[PDB]
């Protein structure tokens, strides 16, 4: 799950580079991910 550093600001904390190979990530990150809409978080950045 790549992180594109680009023109848009990075109010989302930190950057990360990519991490998706663990079977736990199916339901681990959703507790931490999104939490406010779907397109307003996932589609802003961290593209695949």
């Amino acid at each position: 799950f790549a992180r594109p550093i680009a023109k848009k600001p990075t109010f989302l904390r930190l950057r990360g580079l990519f991490e998706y190979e663990i079977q736990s990530w199916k339901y681990s990150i959703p507790l931490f991910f999104t939490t406010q809409g779907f397109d307003t978080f996932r589609n802003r950045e961290i593209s695949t």
Partner: protein, 546 residues
């Protein structure tokens, strides 16, 4: 009372009256009259795009193409400026051509509307600050004391009860004014609160208006381009007091706290009695002997002529205390009881889009203002200083057109009085948002070239006063993070536009309310509690990355 939900009927009497009666009621010498005044007057208008069959259609302009439009519509009167014959190009109806349509337009409207301001408590309010808030509080107080009240402002129009007739542009001509006045007169209302705007009193309107109470809340120097000299500012604004002619049914509410209160009084009929409000100046008829202001609490022990009364409310703002003082003084002018005054004051808990405190189970006060001038943000910042909270964040909007000289000093006062600042993209209908964000810092001492060379190294800067930098464009995420900053008992201003329930970014128009998003974010604060490390400056909202 009866329904409280169904719309009240538009009880407008269709006035029936003839042109000769118009000329006799308002004797104006004709310059381009022809034939005979054999015509029945059915309506009234000034602008051809709103002209229907049978209206006045009066406005000063030469060689207008709107004459043919009114002829097609069928206006009873069609008079802009030009001498025009009958039965060939304006055969719709007869002509009553006057020398100056603007001069006789209030007169013609009053004669047609049977001069409705005499049968009402038409109140004009002058000043610079708190005009809309004063109108709101006065109308709430007047509605509380067992009588209906109206509203004639530039931001809103409350016919009666709670229905709002759509607010038009800043100031139309007196045709619309008298139309809505007839609506007030014959829709169950018995009073109106009229804002004495500079454009209103300048454009020959107050000549045919009967003013019952004239109020002077506060004075400040603004729009000096129109008021080229302070003498013109002090005299044109004093025309409100000059309209006073009967010192037995009319009263004067004056602000002796301001220096030129006797000067304002002396501009016409000082016999009309003077009732004064002032907080810092205790030598006033109505004075808050005890004054206390907090972020969520406000206490006022005010010694009105009736006596000493306690007013407790969360409506903060020292100028708001001045405004409440003016309201109770106005109530004293009509002899209203203190209990009704308190009922009217408490009848409003959040005036629309101005100083709108939002407390959705939180300790950080969400507050918005009109904020169309940097001095408004400066004033709110001084109020915040007087109401010192823990941490200060102010979300700063932008400037619509090429007025680039405001945002330097705006950012100066913000960064000087706020520990952490924030910016957004509120109104940038002229240029690209990136350029607008670039212009935000243009006159005070810091250069955005550092914003060029970020490289994950400039994210932690401490601007001049060690305060924090700020940058963003997405309004939704900006306000979401702004509400998301609030940790415990800090200041969370997200102001910048006020009651503007939309968002423009150059060439966009959609639905967007700041207050609704603020309460929604206060609701998702519960989800926000699950994380929130690395809070202070930058960045935010993403855990498990350290």
């Amino acid at each position: 009372g009866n329904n409280s939900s169904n719309k009240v009927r538009i009880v407008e009497p269709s006035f029936k009256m003839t042109l000769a009666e118009l000329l006799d009621e308002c004797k104006v010498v004709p310059i381009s009259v022809y034939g005979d005044l054999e015509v029945e007057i059915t309506g009234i208008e000034h602008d051809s795009r709103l002209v229907n069959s049978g209206d006045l259609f009066v406005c000063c302009v030469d060689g207008n193409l709107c004459l043919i439009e009114a002829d097609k519509r069928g206006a009873v009167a069609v008079v802009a400026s030009k001498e025009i014959d009958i039965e060939e190009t304006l055969g719709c109806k007869a002509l009553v051509i006057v020398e100056d349509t603007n001069a006789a337009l209030p007169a013609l409207a009053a004669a047609f509307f049977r001069y409705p301001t005499k049968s009402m408590s038409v109140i004009g309010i002058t000043g610079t600050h708190g005009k809309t808030t004063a109108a709101h509080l006065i109308k709430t107080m007047y509605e509380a004391m067992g009588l209906r009240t109206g509203m004639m402002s530039s931001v809103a129009y409350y016919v009666h009860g709670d229905n709002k007739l759509d607010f038009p542009e800043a100031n139309p001509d007196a045709v619309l004014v008298q139309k809505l006045m007839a609506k007030m007169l014959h829709n169950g209302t018995e009073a109106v609160v009229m804002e004495a705007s500079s454009n209103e009193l300048t454009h020959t309107r107050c000549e045919e208006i009967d003013f019952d109470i004239a109020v002077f809340t506060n004075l400040s120097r603004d729009n000096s381009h129109f008021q080229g000299n302070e003498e013109e500012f002090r005299v044109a604004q004093a025309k409100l007091f000059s309209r006073m002619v009967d010192p037995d049914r009319h009263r004067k509410i004056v602000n002796v706290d301001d220096p030129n209160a006797p000067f304002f009084i002396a501009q016409g009929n000082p016999n009309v009695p003077v009732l004064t409000f002032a907080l810092e100046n205790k030598d006033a008829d109505v004075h808050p002997l005890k004054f206390e202001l907090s972020l969520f609490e406000t206490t006022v022990l005010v010694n009105t002529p009736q006596g000493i009364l306690e007013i407790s409310s969360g409506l903060l703002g020292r100028h708001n205390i001045y405004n409440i003082l003016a309201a109770v003084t106005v109530g004293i002018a009509v002899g209203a009881p203190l209990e009704d005054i308190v009922r009217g004051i408490e009848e409003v808990d959040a005036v629309p889009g101005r100083c709108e405190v939002i407390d959705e189970e939180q300790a950080f006060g969400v507050i918005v203002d009109h904020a169309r001038t940097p001095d408004a943000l400066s004033r709110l910042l001084d109020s915040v200083r007087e109401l010192q909270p823990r941490r200060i964040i102010t979300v700063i909007g932008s400037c619509g057109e090429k007025e680039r000289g405001k945002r330097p000093m705006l950012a100066k006062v913000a960064t000087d009085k706020s520990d952490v600042t924030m910016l957004t993209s509120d109104n940038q209908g002229s240029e690209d948002p990136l350029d607008i964000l670039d212009d935000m810092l243009a006159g005070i001492g810091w250069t955005m070239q550092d914003y060029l060379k970020h490289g994950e190294n400039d994210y932690y800067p401490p601007l001049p006063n060690g305060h924090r930098l700020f940058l963003h464009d997405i309004r939704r995420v900006a306000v979401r993070c702004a509400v998301a900053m609030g940790e415990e008992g800090d200041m969370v201003v997200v102001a910048g536009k006020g009651h503007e329930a939309y968002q423009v970014d150059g060439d966009k128009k959609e639905f967007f309310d700041d207050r609704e998003e603020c309460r929604e974010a206060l609701q998702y604060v519960d989800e926000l509690h699950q994380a929130g490390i690395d809070t202070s400056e930058f960045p935010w909202r993403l855990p498990e990355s350290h």
